[PDB]
Symmetry: C2
């Protein structure tokens, strides 16, 4: 239901230096819903609820497992990394829980106004 | 040469708010090579060369066309958005030029030390 390899990637350059991701850090604001997600310090959403600590990924550390509870809004977020570190759960208990398992999260896009309306998570599936 | 839909995405939540990307802004430092790329204000690379202006994507604006010249390093970067805005060319003239055409760039990962060694660009191909 989309052409094969229409979501893809390509590497340019050589083998030197240390790995980094454009997805460098995450924090959220939350109550019973998600108010905001903050990606690399950039705010996405409202100023309600409570600010989490910032989770900063190490070089070669990435989200390997993620649980989102959602409906018309993001209700809860938690994740785990390949190096065993956990973030959350942050948020409340309403909505359907869905889990990404044994992945490498590449990107988090989404939409937000005063609250966190939706996330669109791009990931490799192992 | 990887399973089908092993690089994928999934949407959570509803239809409200304004779109955002985790890939929010880009600037580079450059001379004849790429010294650094700066993604959402996060520095990746060295402190040599000259700092470009920061390119900030509008809601629903994304890189649709990208030219990278590279070898063992990133030598040149330029891009265009779906809304017609251009960034670069920044860098020098050594290496092989490769173009991504009619895409939507999702993520820029890579590796860097004192210079920008490699980029790994994740994108939809239209």
């Amino acid at each position: 239901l989309v052409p094969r390899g229409s979501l893809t990637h390509r590497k340019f350059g050589g083998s030197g230096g240390s790995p980094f991701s454009g997805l460098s850090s995450i924090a959220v604001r939350s109550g019973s819903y998600l108010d905001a997600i903050i990606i690399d310090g950039v705010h996405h959403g409202g100023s309600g609820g409570n600010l989490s600590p910032t989770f900063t990924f190490g070089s070669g550390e990435y989200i390997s497992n993620m649980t989102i509870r959602s409906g018309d809004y993001i209700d809860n977020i938690s994740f785990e990394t390949n190096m065993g570190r956990r973030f959350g759960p942050y948020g409340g208990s309403g909505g359907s829980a869905n889990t990404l398992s044994n992945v490498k999260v590449i990107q988090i896009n989404g939409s937000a106004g005063d609250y966190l309306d939706s996330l669109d998570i791009y990931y490799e599936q192992y």
